[model samples]
Target: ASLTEIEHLVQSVCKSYRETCQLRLEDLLRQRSNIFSREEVTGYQRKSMWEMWERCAHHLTEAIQYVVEFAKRLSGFMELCQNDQIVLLKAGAMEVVLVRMCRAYNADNRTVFFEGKYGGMELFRALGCSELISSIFDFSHSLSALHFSEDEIALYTALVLINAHRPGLQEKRKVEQLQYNLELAFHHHLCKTHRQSILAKLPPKGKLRSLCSQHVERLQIFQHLHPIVVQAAFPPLYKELFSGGGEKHKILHRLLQDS
Candidate 1:
């Protein structure tokens, strides 16, 4: 095939994969929301809040699992070395989780919707981290304002997973190129849809950085509330995929090595 033909082929495949992943993710989230979504508890009880904590914990675990599976299936993900795969999963999972949670964002009420109801922010406040709720609500509002389509989310997510600057990556140049190409595609799509709107001024990487920092703060709040539950719920796999542990110089070693 000619160079242009190959580029088109790559784009086509990426689009197909992006659509498939988005559908699967939405389905999973929908199923969970149908039953777990509920109204904000009145005269809040600690016992009820604890149940919310468990539900949040379970939701995060399931979201992380899907993020892992989704990345592994991306067109360029498997082409990278095993070490790079681990690095991307570790770096990208929580960021994706944050994005997944943002899907629950309700701009009208300025609340985070879990399942199909509001309570995500309230749940955090009930745990004594009002500041975390504020930060997350601000970020979630921004994400909702962006009005990202499923395809846009998937392409941007692929960019998040291929960070060239991640420490200990064995194929830094390859990963960087992959990220660059994905960024171009992402920007192209955004411009195609909204070049005349305020979105033309919105930079994807900068926005992602903002969301990532918010997610970090949110996780820190989670740690403070119930470090033991956080530790027990995450285990090695979730920790590997989500935590930004101190030992950043060494590539993560762990199970689920193949996928």
Candidate 2:
């Protein structure tokens, strides 16, 4: 399919997932609203971006990777659903599986505890304005299914940076933004910290997966292969060799002469 066709498919499936999640969340909120008085809500804690990064960044990465893989599977499922290649029963089963995974990921993110001192409200507030996170997830979710340009990813990265701060947003909007910010921060951190190993693993003709497919396939070697392992292999940041720097301010020179 063309990029336009793939984009439409992804948008449709993502809306399905998001709407399903929204319905479940609304039900839970209703069930709990009676117990949570307005006065009690006023005294609840709030979170900061750094605080969130410290607490749940690790697990968030894995959940995001799962989302990417799930989307890939979904493209195939969508075609089958369109063609009536499978029974409606299987479609129902697949939808449940995807919904459950989304809910589980959502719960993992919501249930994160900063040593049990902070709660969901506070954490969600901290990440509420994160545009960078929103953009990356949207792009990655799109890219996982079909071809997407790096320029698009770069544009979204800029958006994330602009909304990186937690400046207070509506409850629903904040939760959405935080989810995005957390995802991008995971990508940024993983790529920057692991640049060297990633660069070293690049194959001839720049076919990275071909070069590292064996390492990726050696699932038995590692006890657990989380998103970080896969992400670390292809980081967002890159580096090049540097030459001598003699005539500039040491710190400024070093920083500017990035290699």
Candidate 3:
């Protein structure tokens, strides 16, 4: 009973408030600027863009933090219903949207043309923290081991893309710290795995699992420079966004074709 109410509340917050605000912000950015406007861009938009991002990022980050905490609440609800949690139904979905937006802001995109901006680094750091939401999503599925379902693999594929796009560090100490962690985890890590192949492919259509892995690796490499996301900042919009208008059919088609 409690679970149902919480779910409904989350739903209301996500749809009625978060989603509308997200779209409005996107439209505002798209309309007012033909470039990536950062914190120091000058004029009314300079402050406006940073303030808008701060407001949106703060709320979304707070929501995602709550989601990371209450994912177990979600799990309990799912257990009672024996119903799979639809991607769209999850609050984590909003986090993904926000994270993706940050990714775009940090990188050059069709809408974000300004380069060498100051706030891109800050945006990257924000993404690094927000990505914990994905990790929580991973935990909810009990995907703690290598042996996972095809669906789990599919989710991992997407995660790889998300994880790939991160900020790069310039300081030697930070670089060394990351390298030490990387070496400790996989021991002599070579990224020439299936994930690399998929990302290297143009338009990335085919060998799903492999392609996903490849796409993920590419996103990860972006950390060496700046924060990026699943695809380029201005990735070719494969489908319409919002208005309940994403094409699962086309996504599957590309997934299969590239594989």
RMSD of each: 4.7, 21.8, 20.1
TM-score of each: 0.72, 0.22, 0.22
Compared to the true structure, candidate 3 yields what TM-score? 0.22
lDDT of 3 by residue, 1-259 (tens): 2445434433432232332232344453454334335544433243433343334344444434333322223212222211112221231334333323332231232222123222323333333333433333333222222332222222222232222112332243433433333222221111322233322321221222332243234334433444332122322222211111323323322322342
Report how far residue 125 has shifted in candidate 3, in Å.
Answer: 5.8
lDDT of each: 0.61, 0.30, 0.30
Candidate 3: deviation at residue 77, Å?
Answer: 12
- Please state the error at residue 61 of candidate 3 in Å: 4.2
lDDT of 3: 0.30
Q: Per-residue lDDT for 1-259 in model 1, tens only? A: 3445435534753565464453354553454433323443443434444455556556666767667777666777778888788878777776776665556666666555454445545545454546655766776777778777666666666767778988899999999877777767666666667633634644465665665666566666666766777666544454444455624323244333543
User: Considering summed lDDT, which 10 consecutive residues are worst modelled in model 2?
Assistant: 237-246
Model number with the top lDDT: 1
* Candidate 3 regions with alpha-carbon error over 4 angstroms: 1-21, 24-57, 61-95, 98-118, 122-259
Clashing pairs in 1: 33-115
**Backbone clashes (count) for model 2:** 7
Clashes of each: 1, 7, 16
